[PDB]
Symmetry: C3
Subunit: 671 residues, 3 copies
């Protein structure tokens, strides 16, 4: 199932259409292997999916309170990742990748395929495929270092049981802690995971469970800027511009079960259920504001905690039949997601309401005393979603022409203990259509129309349409593409247009002489993408590509920012990762390099503040051998080799510094 | 005509004496190949000629408004380079070397050979030999990167035409743009060149034309220091100490034609004609001054633009005959150069006359707003030069003794539309003599006497001799040397004394109670040079040397600085470039290193300010292979790999920082 | 005598017990070869012994006025090294290792074996074994570079003479000079050494002499901190926090002779005599004090010079006898050491009495003018020590059980020309016992009890017991260990407890209503050490280990700091140095890496100030080949490759910055 090079897989999960090969998939998809994850020494999902993919963008900060990435120029929430196709299971804000065999990306919205995930983001879907036991007993220990002083280890063990190895047990354990590459920042991660499976004659069961901890001392919050003051030059890249005493901690625990039942070679049922809990806590700056061009920083302090309990389910049937010369491959499913949440916080900490005044260039800032962590209860909230979907792929000529049609009906309801307005469920129906034509055994041409959904907002009691809750809001994509598999090297070329609506109270629009809450806002992202992966020549691997994006705010409240460029994202990206192997003694030496080049980004929707493009370099070396026939692999990587200091836009604040030059070492041994 | 290693050629153009071999040339000469240029990833001529040559010195700044180098301890102006032996064609201030097959240096003055080039510099002559089409059709594409974010490409394509391939067309095109290695500095270069030739039975014609752009944003101008304040420690090497908004742009366009006609095997005529235009624009600091030992910098702003139209010609006869046992090879020529120029500028920019105050160590200097570029017309100027030269080389004893004798008459006139003083042409006659003895077929001993000319200065209205224009001023060299070609490795050892006059207003010589303008000043440069090139053992290349230079101010105004050491140049240099090849899979891996070690330099003629010596290291790797039988070469270079911060003296200001650690990558493919 | 890998030897000198093998030595011992020394490009003894040994700690500053290291958590003075077993010969404060064949370490105190060395330090003994002529004539030249601009060379030549090569001459000469890796620091070293030997039938003579110079401009003195102000973040690693004009120079000259006479195979005599002189001069800061969290530094200036003339001797007998099945090997000796010293200095320099005020973060501090060096004579002083010792090693059960017993009687007297208090000799008697069991041919278990001695302090005139001189003070060790020699790889596991007394004025213990001077203080170091060396698989070398140390202040003045952790030393260390060889062309390429990880250290005995742990990385490459059958080796090393900035505790002041990233190159050629 692995492509030449061993770092990319040949198939991925296409939502409820299930597993499909590269040349059969009328969507821009990529699937990274666990070998790739270990080769990058990836510490989070971003470090897997953003490194070579020009359609993914991260601000690249070290030690933030979550991962942050865009796909096709739109936010793709960490909340919205799937685990083996099921949403609401994965860690809330950051995921260390040790428990995954594959990390899959499907670019653009996918409501027909996947329904509406909990945060309603539309950029793309990240699907994490868990590890299960291979046939041969397996035990691998890996030790890790990351500068300045973060040490860790990871154990991965598998074995199968029973007369026909019908049972599997796969366990991963990981711990790392210590000072990171940013001053006064330390990063602690912990994971324990279990992947269990039973393979029956007609039936199969897969069970996954994990317990995770993510903790950052000296967490990065980022800083705000104004047009009056402007953006000063970035301090050196290892500067921490949030309180040294600030910290974030997230505990995630999840479990899921999937069953499959083969009625025949033409019909199968499946059911999946899962639950997870998240406990988040944050004590630190709510925002730092740069109040002078000389680097004065005024930081207000805040505290936040929330606890959320999630449950999710997805069940259905898949079948196939041939009528005349036409093959039908169909799927029908029903999905459910529910969460209950409690929020706690201080906007103003009692006794700590004065801002802390520092300077961003000070080598020795005084962040003052740490406020005790005691945020009071604010409100209880719930979210409930359900869907049911149907799709059919009609094919002829041995699958060389494939037309997919489907619909999904989606419902959503939200509640909050402090909302006084009506709370009602709302629904929408979302279609999709895709066409794929195989020009040759190597070339597929495809097109799709598909939507993304986002929970509707609620009009205030003051509106002409008072208290109206909008139905799920449709993001719309059209895409045309071309895929070429030359054998050991593969290309994808695609062009897309995606429109995403937004809602606001508009006093320019009266009904009954009252302001109307409208869904009249729009962002439109047009893009063209050329990407590639594999081995173009023997002993060489290349992954990367080029994108041009036009992310336009086409319609904004009062028209003030109409035609402006969306914030945060660059219009242009070029990424290339290369590896070259040489046989030396009794093993393989690999040298690697990465270049990541982006153009400028706007910091505000007025487009009066921006930060420039930047190009980052990475280099690495790997040595793979056997010691007494035991596989051993040594890895060394330097990220941000030039130690470029740059501003980029995180969530919730205007700017954060990009990660500094970072050294990583690992050694693995197979018992 | 390539020496072992492929990086140095075995002959060069010895002004109007034409092409001569290494062991037949009674001057210290070196010629670099286009292979060497590509191997260094040279971006300008300095990066070719300074890297390994201990008789050439550069201050080594990144993104200056021109190149800056000394030869034998005297300035050698960028204005004074020749193209295929003709002056006034090459780019005015910086030349990217993609259109040249050779870059040739002749060390020391050469007025007999070359006449007086436009800026009257005397250190040495740099001759750029253009590319013409080889017999086999040729196409090479190269992609380039230079840190942080400069990307570019270069196409080189040649083909010959006609039944006997008597016509050739060679085209180069190059573009690169983006952030350089210095903070807030970006470099843009563009070149399009055409090399055309026709080879007849008794005649030959060569045509060359190019269009070039050089543009730097965040141009480095340098800073001034005083004895009262002193020289502070250098900021980190990637600091820009000129306005971040400052920029320079030079557009150069040139064309030349050379024709030769063979009357017989004993007589030939030749003629060369060319023209060029330069359009220069600068908006930035005119100088920074360090006004405190805390690092306070006061930067006055200025603007300059000039447009210059140049024409140039060189025509003559060459012949040979024998008288008894003596062979004669003689040449007679006439040369002409004319330019017209318009200057525009502000010494004091309206609204920007106050200097911008920063600190050299600040990470966030405030350079203020960028002034609009509207410099008014100042004056029209012209420069005209002409010469008539004669030389004969007499050969005795089967060409083992070669005596060259010659003289040249040189005229020069300058005008300015705002000069009120008389304008008159002035002339001088400059002789030369050189003797070469071939001790063996491998060993040559040589001596020369030769001069360099510089336009005479004009006495100011305040002098006893007001408005007097001095004739062209004679720099005088005597040299003794030894050359040894061992086969695949060669040595040169030479010793020289060069005296250069200077003119000034002298209050110690009163005539009618007024100071007299005199041509009494002198600098005397004495030196010893040992250098070498080639392959001293299999799979190794080695090029470099050692120099000692004693650049003394022997006569100065009022005797105040008599016996002091000249500014800017080091007394000691040691340079070594090494390469080592080894077979790796199906290709050749080359590892390279360079060291460049110099001693201290004085910053003022009083010798009360100095900067220390520094040692710079470079490393590189190259991999040459084939992909489907197409030659491919990968190149990686790190210059200033330790990222040493150092001051050195540029033109017009006292100090500028040396270039920081800089990464360069390239990939070439032959079609 | 060399272990697998060539970097460690299989035996070492165990004080007067003489040469013993690894598995026969009931002490934790290691001996490094001259090959290891050249492989590290070690510039001093610290760079040999601390790199991989987790029981040795250095603060790691560049260009201090001496080396500074701890063994088993106690100071081990540079003054206390032996040369071929003799104390008082080696350079006083820093030793460049070019003249040594072996650098041996014995961990923990060793008074029975070694007596009391001149500074009375107890952490361990470093024994430097000089080079003598091998049988085959030898001549090696090595050139060196160290960043930024330090160049040097080293010649090593040997030849033997006489019909049976019974005479040997071995000469080393080394010079290096230039700018080092710290800002405004330059390092000059010089050495000339001679090793002569005569091998007779029943007698042998060895003579050694050397003349050395160590000079640092921009010497690092370190800085003081208070609890009121605290420890600010370290400036960048290449910062010099002492005067740029400050300098230190030490000249050391030494010579020794050793003679042996074999009366029979059961009895031998030996005698060793030596002398040395040291001339020390220091002009610079006496201390800098950090007086604000903004980085304000107040430096007082001082001058010190001292001259010391040393003489030393060690003579005895060794023999063997048997009592039944028990073999006896015994030794008896007498030792002597005397020095005379003159001290000169200013505590307050006339004209320079005001402190110099700088800031630690200033890139351009103003250190003011350099005071002339004229320190006046202060006082004459002397130190005299003598001992007599006896030991027997009883070997039972075919040498599988080896019991060593002995005692030594030690005397010491000090004088000073400005002391008015009484001056009297004092004595002590010190036992030692060690047991070694060879469990197999590969495995040894051992235990020891042994002491270290330090000259007693003298009670001040203010005490109840004024002028009382305490006898030599007993440091006491118990140790248990395990050694395993697997063949080409070896392990040591040891545990120790060492108590060291200290003396102070106790205000709680009144005699005649006055405080009493007592020898009641104690530090107790408990530790566990796991270390290893050799070649665990072909083409790989690995050296390093892990230690846990508990250095507790068990008894302190007034009980104030009882139970606190001792200053300066970390509780945890992990070190690993690895090398990997592969054939490239006609030679061997070695890649090397080192990691050095330590935990936090306390800065004061109150344990209210500390500095964090740090982890340092080093890398290197070596290429060994032949050119025309002459051995040539190229070496490249980068130390502190991440350029980590850290504080650690030097001698006499609270803090000093660790050495920055440092580049080293060398090339050797064998004639
Ligand atoms: C510190 C090692 C630097 C090695 C030379 C610079 C190479 C930079 O690599 C960037 C990677 O890009 C390679 C192609 O993609």
């Amino acid at each position: 199932d692995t492509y030449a090079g061993g770092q990319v897989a040949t198939s991925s999960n296409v939502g409820f259409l299930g597993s499909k090969k590269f040349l059969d998939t009328p969507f821009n998809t990529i699937s990274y292997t666990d070998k790739y994850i270990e080769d990058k020494q990836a510490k989070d999902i971003t470090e897997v999916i953003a490194a070579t993919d020009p359609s993914i963008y991260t601000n690249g900060a070290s030690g933030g309170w979550s991962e942050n990435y865009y796909i096709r120029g739109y936010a793709s929430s960490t909340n919205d990742m799937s685990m083996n196709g099921l949403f609401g299971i994965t860690p809330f804000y950051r995921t260390s990748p040790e428990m995954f065999g594959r990390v899959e990306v499907l670019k653009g919205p996918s409501a027909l395929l996947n329904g509406m995930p909990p945060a309603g983001s539309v950029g793309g879907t990240v699907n994490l495929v868990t590890k299960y036991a291979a046939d041969e007993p397996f035990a691998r220990l890996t030790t890790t270092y990351m500068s300045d002083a973060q040490f860790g280890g990871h154990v991965d063990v598998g074995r199968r049981f029973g007369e026909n190895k019908e049972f599997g047990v796969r366990i991963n354990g990981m711990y790392r802690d210590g000072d990171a590459a940013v001053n006064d920042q330390s990063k602690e991660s912990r994971l324990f995971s279990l992947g269990l499976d039973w393979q029956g004659e007609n039936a199969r069961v897969f069970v996954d469970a994990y317990d995770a901890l993510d903790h950052v001392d000296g967490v990065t919050r980022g800083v705000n800027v104004s047009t009056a003051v402007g953006i000063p030059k970035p301090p050196k890249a290892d500067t921490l511009l949030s309180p040294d005493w600030g910290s974030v901690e997230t505990k995630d625990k999840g479990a899921m079960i999937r069953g499959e039942y083969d009625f025949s070679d033409q019909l199968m049922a499946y059911a999946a259920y899962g639950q997870s809990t998240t406990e988040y806590k944050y004590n630190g700056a709510s925002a730092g504001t740069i109040t002078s061009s000389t680097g004065t920083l005024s930081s207000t302090l805040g505290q936040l905690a929330f606890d959320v309990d999630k449950k999710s389910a997805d069940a259905g049937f898949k079948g196939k039949f041939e009528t005349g010369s036409v093959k039908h491959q169909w799927v029908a499913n029903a999905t459910y997601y529910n969460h209950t949440q409690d929020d706690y916080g201080y906007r103003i900490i009692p006794g700590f309401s004065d801002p802390v005044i520092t300077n961003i260039y000070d080598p020795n800032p005084n962040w003052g005393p740490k406020p005790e962590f005691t945020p009071p209860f604010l409100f209880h909230s719930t979210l409930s979603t359900s869907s049911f979907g149907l799709a059919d792929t009609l094919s002829f000529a041995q699958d060389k022409v494939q037309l997919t049609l489907g619909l999904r009906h989606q419902t959503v309801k939200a509640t909050s203990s402090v909302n006084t307005l009506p709370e009602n469920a709302k629904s929408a129906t979302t279609p999709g259509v895709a066409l794929l034509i195989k020009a040759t055994d190597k070339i597929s041409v495809y097109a799709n129309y598909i939507e993304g959904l986002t929970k509707g907002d609620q009009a205030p009691a003051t509106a002409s349409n008072p208290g109206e809750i909008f139905p799920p809001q449709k993001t719309k994509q059209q895409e045309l593409g071309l895929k070429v598999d030359l054998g050991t090297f593969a290309h994808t070329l695609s062009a897309f247009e995606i429109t995403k609506p937004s809602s606001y109270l508009d006093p320019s629009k009266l009904v009954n002489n009252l302001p109307t809450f409208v869904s009249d806002g729009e962002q439109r992202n047009r893009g063209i993408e050329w990407s590639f992966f594999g081995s173009p020549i023997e002993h060489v691997r290349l992954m990367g590509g080029f994108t041009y994006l036009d992310p336009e705010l086409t319609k904004t409240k009062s028209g003030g920012n109409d035609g402006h460029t969306a914030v945060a994202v660059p219009k242009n990206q070029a990424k290339l990762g290369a590896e070259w192997d040489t046989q030396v003694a009794q093993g393989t030496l690999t040298l690697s390099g990465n270049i990541n080049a982006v153009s400028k980004q706007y910091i505000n929707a007025e487009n009066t503040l921006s930060v420039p493009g930047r190009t980052l370099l990475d280099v690495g070396a790997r040595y793979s051998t056997k010691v007494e026939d035991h596989p051993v692999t040594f890895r060394a990587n330097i990220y941000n080799l030039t130690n470029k200091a740059y501003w980029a836009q995180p969530q919730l604040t205007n700017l954060a510094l990009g990660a500094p030059r970072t050294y990583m070492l690992s050694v693995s041994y197979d018992f």
